[PDB]
């Protein structure tokens, strides 16, 4: 036998979740999942972004969730994450096709913030601007990783 | 002659996550709805006998590698007995452990069988959980009224 | 991690046999009905846009390795244009040769698309056969009224 | 890619044919097919039933249509053909599961009557007696191969 | 399912044969097996070259020996066979990598001349010109099928 | 990603040879080829029979040619070789299905002779003392001879 | 997809290492890599042995290193690990075929002691008794996990 | 039917070694192992460079270790070896991803030295003259030396 196929199930599972639960809540559910995946498989402690890239691809390769490039952006030392071939699971998600994308946000977040302390206080953010979402495939997810903060006035409004 | 992404790990982590936040009964209900949804995506032809339905359902399971199933119509209660081998295991979540996916089958057999020819229509699905006789991934269900 | 029987040869010989005994138009009609039958066995969810339908149909094709498809809604006629790549080839039968299976797709897209949300319902399926621009196994169809 | 899957198609194709066309006509259609398959793949000329068996299995193996044993029955020199794992194609056919069985009748017929002249004037016959159809799997088809004949009174009634 | 590998066996077989036996005797040996393969798998009777081509590629596909095109050449009456991905079994043959090439000659011989009473009259010859074996990859094997003919004292030389 | 199938070629090749050359000459030829293969892939030098066994099985796994046990017999100083799943190529050979068997002689002959103290004075003989054994199981002995 | 094969590489690596370095140094080396593998793939925190077992087998499945059972032994407090199909890489190791066994010790070490504060205190030791390595296949590796302890002059011996 | 994956083991093994032993000692070790592998699988004795090439590629196909070209340079009498797709095992080695590269030296060293008249006076040197070449492409030269 092969292993069983979950594509059908996730197609229908994503439909149900989306029906019952807002875009928001579902995304937050999916990042926690991705964060948890990253407690199950992890890179070793890498010396350089490049080495981190090779190790992440090895991990992706292990479950066939595609390939990734990492680019350290000096101008603000954010890190650009370009993930290719996010597995497609039916037409849910925004854009349609990309339901699993938050899983990556949580995955990359756990993965990358495990590094030197160099990337300790970082947060992942999916690039959703339809502009540069256009010239790149449906199943390509672009994320940026940067350091977090918070206003005193945001602080209330718990 | 190429490859497909694996969802096993993701489902281990989804299940764990769901079980953590929402609890058992509520997970089951959802899973049932989803299996019931699957059933609107793939479905058998209108079958005339149980034998024939059995074959059509195994053909459906083979398509997605979800195991095998036997079907038994019972004299005493006019109840249909469903014995499903090899439910895909996704980690240690579920009752008993390894069986998180079980209610998907309830939803699924629920839908696949009622779309059927005759008084089949009006039955419902309970999963047996009383009667170490049967392997971890074997799920036993009844369709009965 | 095991194997499945091949039907290619059998279909080469079936096609040849059918084409021999019953002729072209009658073969097409049958094949259309069969594709239309397939459509009652696997089916997309209710889609709201064409983009979404496209993805759902490719997911269905992938399941059975029947190729890929693009879908295009046209201003001028409100016509939907279907371009299917890699129809399984089964030997040299069909018009043009290699394409015996083409009308299965007519039946199939016929059913998959009409079960759909909206005025989708009332369309019909012609296959284009006028306009060496497009590969042997690419089938072009219109859904138009 | 794999090759495409025809199981779905044949499930539905066998349904349609059975709907429109009697058991009889469909079987006769399927033997002609099997006979034609045997014009596409064939054994070499074998010296012994055993050698013929090995060569047929090699051919079966080539398209995964299962395995076969051949037994030469001295008492009447019929040949017993026991085919295992006829591919299953949905629930049509009698018994349900065995829609493709006549394909074998035509296949074996071409295959076996290609031999020495030893098996020249032979006809294939599927054993359908529910008795010894019982203790053997659904996808096991038993055929007997024997020499043909015909009454003068059968001869009219064209 | 998991099959045995013959590549190494053939690597050593070709080398041994080539050692004991001429280039010429080896080729003739290999054409005969080639024509024997044609007795075991066949196209149906095709109405046109194009259909013949589809039917031959299906056969090639069956045993994974690569692909082919056929072009009817009429300034001449010959048929140009271009075969891609002749399986490679080590360094034997001329050019090296190409030992199995005569098998093609025998196979295409049988395969083509079974066809429309037109072709039955043809001999296969392999193009070995330096010129246009150079435009094309080493496992590409080019054959022409032409119609045969002979001379009053080529015979008497025997 | 798909490699080419050689079975049908081998089926037809075996036939062609067996037609034209004989059996004893075929056998001799196939034994050289087995010898040849053993110059292409080899075990390390082995300390024990049990080690050699694992080593040889790794070599057979590598090309999918089956599995083998090795038994060292004391009474006479011989080595019983049992090979399961000789690849079958059609109905040629003695018995039918085992055309490739002599390749095994050449091969084990070479793989074992290579050996440090598995005497390169060891010769090879395929057997029909031990019969029922599956069609594709081949039995062989390696015992030392002194030169006729 | 088609992966590279390391079996031969490991066959030669084990042999070379064993040549240069003691049995003991090799095992210790291999436990460390074993425990490093445990830093790259992990179970989640399991509530019971049985669940731990399911989670460990899933991990094993991931890299195809075989299967395992865990039995809580309470006349004692030890945990009996029985691992099947330790990958074989040639004839090295004691018994031969078993070179990779210490990797298991390090891997199970990390894997089990991550678990319920209960286990964190445990050392893995491999059962190598003649007796019950004989009931079981050579790639079956039996380990016990017990809790650690030490002596006032085993220390002073350093 | 599934064999075991060694990648994760290799990723972790490379790391462990590189931690504890150095690079030059690692390299030396891996070169012996390549030497070792070349005693386990070998080409036939080759007449030409072009033949050797096909032969070596068949050996690499056998274990999925990539492909190689061989070029014989006249000006000095050297042989340029270009290996594509060195198996990658994690981010170890110089550059990252190429930990296994020295195995290639041992291996080509052995496979070529074996050769009739590919001089067993030929030594090996891996190169960083030729840079962009893909991460997993390894370039090597074999040129004769006389002993320092």
Tab-separated table of C-alpha atoms in Angstrom, chain G:
chain	number	residue	atom	x	y	z
G	1	UNK	CA	10.994	12.136	-6.887
G	2	UNK	CA	14.055	9.738	-6.691
G	3	UNK	CA	16.382	9.752	-3.603
G	4	UNK	CA	20.096	8.912	-3.290
G	5	UNK	CA	21.029	5.598	-1.627
G	6	UNK	CA	23.368	5.630	1.373
G	7	UNK	CA	23.443	1.935	2.133
G	8	UNK	CA	26.768	1.302	0.427
G	9	UNK	CA	28.233	4.523	1.814
G	10	UNK	CA	27.322	3.403	5.343
G	11	UNK	CA	28.658	-0.040	4.659
G	12	UNK	CA	32.000	1.466	3.914
G	13	UNK	CA	31.770	4.203	6.598
G	14	UNK	CA	31.070	1.724	9.439
G	15	UNK	CA	33.943	-0.452	8.297
G	16	UNK	CA	36.380	2.400	8.154
G	17	UNK	CA	35.359	3.770	11.525
G	18	UNK	CA	35.499	0.370	13.167
G	19	UNK	CA	39.002	0.018	11.738
G	20	UNK	CA	40.389	3.274	13.215
G	21	UNK	CA	38.467	3.466	16.429
G	22	UNK	CA	37.414	1.095	19.255
G	23	UNK	CA	34.039	-0.680	19.503
G	24	UNK	CA	33.443	1.484	22.546
G	25	UNK	CA	34.390	4.816	20.996
G	26	UNK	CA	32.286	4.014	17.993
G	27	UNK	CA	29.174	3.195	20.152
G	28	UNK	CA	29.606	6.417	22.176
G	29	UNK	CA	29.949	8.418	18.915
G	30	UNK	CA	26.769	6.764	17.623
G	31	UNK	CA	24.758	7.461	20.802
G	32	UNK	CA	25.544	11.160	20.520
G	33	UNK	CA	24.339	11.290	16.880
G	34	UNK	CA	21.359	9.275	18.079
G	35	UNK	CA	20.591	11.934	20.663
G	36	UNK	CA	21.163	14.626	18.020
G	37	UNK	CA	18.502	12.966	15.825
G	38	UNK	CA	16.244	13.322	18.818
G	39	UNK	CA	16.800	17.108	18.724
G	40	UNK	CA	15.561	17.130	15.106
G	41	UNK	CA	12.410	14.966	15.438
G	42	UNK	CA	10.236	14.693	18.581
G	43	UNK	CA	7.100	13.322	20.003
G	44	UNK	CA	4.655	15.738	21.643
G	45	UNK	CA	4.258	15.421	25.392
G	46	UNK	CA	2.318	12.131	25.804
G	47	UNK	CA	0.081	11.247	28.767
G	48	UNK	CA	0.712	7.455	28.736
G	49	UNK	CA	3.255	4.892	27.437
G	50	UNK	CA	0.745	3.585	24.943
G	51	UNK	CA	0.375	7.060	23.472
G	52	UNK	CA	4.149	7.500	23.570
G	53	UNK	CA	4.406	4.243	21.582
G	54	UNK	CA	2.009	5.475	18.887
G	55	UNK	CA	3.896	8.753	18.652
G	56	UNK	CA	7.329	7.047	18.412
G	57	UNK	CA	6.211	4.568	15.707
G	58	UNK	CA	4.901	7.548	13.665
G	59	UNK	CA	8.385	9.081	13.934
G	60	UNK	CA	10.119	5.864	13.019
G	61	UNK	CA	7.671	5.636	10.064
G	62	UNK	CA	8.823	8.998	8.956
G	63	UNK	CA	12.345	7.863	8.140
G	64	UNK	CA	11.497	4.177	7.767
G	65	UNK	CA	13.726	2.931	10.616
G	66	UNK	CA	11.229	0.260	11.635
G	67	UNK	CA	8.877	-0.117	14.636
G	68	UNK	CA	8.751	-0.358	18.366
G	69	UNK	CA	6.870	-1.432	21.444
G	70	UNK	CA	7.187	-0.026	24.981
G	71	UNK	CA	6.059	-2.008	28.054
G	72	UNK	CA	5.971	-0.420	31.537
G	73	UNK	CA	7.546	-3.040	33.780
G	74	UNK	CA	6.427	-2.773	37.359
G	75	UNK	CA	7.910	-5.425	39.496
G	76	UNK	CA	10.656	-3.087	38.556
G	77	UNK	CA	10.042	0.474	37.350
G	78	UNK	CA	11.904	-0.024	34.025
G	79	UNK	CA	10.617	0.430	30.499
G	80	UNK	CA	11.337	-2.364	27.999
G	81	UNK	CA	11.941	-1.080	24.484
G	82	UNK	CA	11.707	-3.635	21.738
G	83	UNK	CA	12.649	-2.175	18.368
G	84	UNK	CA	12.159	-4.030	15.092
G	85	UNK	CA	13.996	-3.630	11.762
G	86	UNK	CA	16.911	-1.562	12.806
G	87	UNK	CA	18.200	-0.668	9.325
G	88	UNK	CA	21.073	-2.934	8.315
G	89	UNK	CA	24.213	-1.492	6.821
G	90	UNK	CA	26.503	-4.406	6.133
G	91	UNK	CA	28.243	-6.788	8.541
G	92	UNK	CA	29.699	-4.455	11.168
G	93	UNK	CA	28.558	-4.339	14.800
G	94	UNK	CA	27.933	-6.818	17.546
G	95	UNK	CA	26.070	-8.913	16.517
G	96	UNK	CA	26.859	-8.260	12.817
G	97	UNK	CA	24.188	-6.230	10.992
G	98	UNK	CA	23.596	-4.148	14.047
G	99	UNK	CA	26.108	-1.310	13.798
G	100	UNK	CA	23.398	1.328	14.032
G	101	UNK	CA	22.022	-0.009	17.336
G	102	UNK	CA	23.664	2.597	19.608
G	103	UNK	CA	21.887	5.273	17.515
G	104	UNK	CA	18.664	3.833	18.803
G	105	UNK	CA	19.978	4.070	22.390
G	106	UNK	CA	20.660	7.755	22.031
G	107	UNK	CA	17.450	8.341	20.117
G	108	UNK	CA	15.161	6.501	22.571
G	109	UNK	CA	17.174	8.238	25.360
G	110	UNK	CA	16.293	11.700	24.138
G	111	UNK	CA	12.855	10.704	22.999
G	112	UNK	CA	11.674	9.049	26.220
G	113	UNK	CA	13.156	11.396	28.813
G	114	UNK	CA	11.608	14.459	27.147
G	115	UNK	CA	8.450	12.807	28.371
G	116	UNK	CA	6.381	13.027	31.624
G	117	UNK	CA	8.658	14.345	34.418
G	118	UNK	CA	8.550	10.626	35.415
G	119	UNK	CA	10.920	9.362	32.661
G	120	UNK	CA	13.324	12.347	32.420
G	121	UNK	CA	15.525	10.546	34.921
G	122	UNK	CA	16.273	7.445	32.913
G	123	UNK	CA	19.230	5.841	31.181
G	124	UNK	CA	18.859	3.531	28.167
G	125	UNK	CA	20.862	0.311	28.207
G	126	UNK	CA	20.924	-2.341	25.480
G	127	UNK	CA	20.188	-5.956	26.419
G	128	UNK	CA	22.923	-8.078	24.786
G	129	UNK	CA	22.341	-11.407	26.547
G	130	UNK	CA	22.978	-14.439	24.370
G	131	UNK	CA	19.647	-15.927	25.670
G	132	UNK	CA	17.009	-13.548	24.313
G	133	UNK	CA	18.878	-12.027	21.364
G	134	UNK	CA	18.356	-15.632	20.159
G	135	UNK	CA	14.590	-15.776	20.375
G	136	UNK	CA	14.582	-12.606	18.202
G	137	UNK	CA	15.696	-11.598	14.683
G	138	UNK	CA	19.158	-9.983	14.344
G	139	UNK	CA	17.750	-6.518	13.504
G	140	UNK	CA	15.524	-6.649	16.591
G	141	UNK	CA	17.223	-4.497	19.240
G	142	UNK	CA	16.072	-4.768	22.876
G	143	UNK	CA	16.611	-1.871	25.270
G	144	UNK	CA	15.650	-1.199	28.850
G	145	UNK	CA	15.194	2.251	30.235
G	146	UNK	CA	15.914	2.403	33.951
G	147	UNK	CA	16.567	5.271	36.362
G	148	UNK	CA	20.272	6.255	37.007
G	149	UNK	CA	22.430	6.078	40.272
G	150	UNK	CA	26.241	6.225	41.337
G	151	UNK	CA	29.022	5.339	43.966
G	152	UNK	CA	31.451	7.235	46.237
G	153	UNK	CA	34.468	5.604	44.699
G	154	UNK	CA	33.380	4.919	41.149
G	155	UNK	CA	33.689	8.755	41.052
G	156	UNK	CA	37.065	9.036	42.746
G	157	UNK	CA	38.333	6.744	40.018
G	158	UNK	CA	39.067	9.450	37.438
